[model samples]
Target: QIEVGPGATNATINFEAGILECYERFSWQRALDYPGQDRLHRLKRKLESRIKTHNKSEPENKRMSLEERKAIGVKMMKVLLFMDPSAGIEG
Candidate 1:
């Protein structure tokens, strides 16, 4: 749902809010049970930090755009999908 087309105007939804929700909802309990959990945890931290940096008060040139932040969300999801295809299945 986060994916947007070339002509898309930065966002179709709120990437900050959406990504924060996804970060919070991620199954940390089950995530730690998997092998290569270090990588998973690192990814978790990366997501947190990305959100943090994006939220901090900064000039436009120093801030991450909606598309860039959305890419981070996609990156996190891609990793989880690799570890388990159903990692993000909410339906």
Candidate 2:
């Protein structure tokens, strides 16, 4: 997992363990709830429309490419990291 924090100064083993457990449980819930016909499809459609509009407004070479979108995905992971630092700890 990518961590962008300033760094931990204390012995956070217990805190990290608990956070990891909670993150695993919540991720399971999200996966089960949004696998196919839940809320993710609609949310993705909305976001895709916004992305398309932004892409159209920019110059061809300056517009966001697949690689740029992938980078944006990495940046988005930072938000999730802030929400739960142990997000991918299960694997």
Candidate 3:
């Protein structure tokens, strides 16, 4: 649902929802048991707050721009896919 890099597209809400869903599905116990799992949680929290702030802001200038949002999404999506290729696949 998200495309990154030079031709990035927006799937803002879905991207947020997707990562949140994965975060909830993967328990802290599993995170500690697996390598890089903890990072996933960290990233999720960071993105969660940022996205919320961007969304909650009233003015366009107050929110993160499409390009900025795409940049952040790409970064998080990279980590997400690295940890679980199954994610971002809409599976």
Candidate 4:
């Protein structure tokens, strides 16, 4: 994740959403990008692959539900908010 300015909040949310969408859309490509030699990358690849597998096994029309997408957006926002002390979150 990257540090974003106050004016870039919306743009940051959109960027994060796009990244998540890309992971969903091109899961195999995402998996391929994982470095096998890197422990962190390997773990991330495994988790992402699991998500892809679940997506594949579910109904096609429900692949990327709006609720799920919104949840991801909210999650991204929370991370961003946590990074900004001026945003006023409790410790």
Q: lDDT rank, highest first?
A: 3, 4, 1, 2
Q: lDDT at 12 for candidate 4?
A: 40
Superposed on all Cα atoms, the candidates' RMSDs to the truth, in angstroms, are 9.9, 12.6, 9.1, 12.8
- lDDT per prediction? 0.50, 0.45, 0.55, 0.50
Question: What lDDT is obtained when candidate 1 is compared to the true structure?
Answer: 0.50
What candidate 4 gets wrong by more than 4 Å, as runs, is 1-37, 65-91
For model 1, the run of ten residues with the poorest summed lDDT = 7-16
Deviation in Å, model 2, residue 9 alpha carbon: 35
Query: In terms of lDDT, which candidate is strongest?
Result: 3
* Winner on TM-score (2 vs 3): 2
Off by over 4 Å in 3: 1-10, 28-32, 57-91
Show model 1 residue runs off by greater than 4 Å.
Answer: 1-35, 57-91
Q: TM-scores of all models?
A: 0.29, 0.40, 0.35, 0.30
For model 3, residues 23-85, the per-residue Cα lDDT tens digits are 555664455345456666676667667667656754666566433555555556765777865
**Candidate 3 or 4, higher TM-score?**
3
Worst 10 residues of 3 by lDDT: 6-15
Best by TM-score: 2
Off by over 4 Å in 2: 1-30, 34-37, 65-70, 79-91
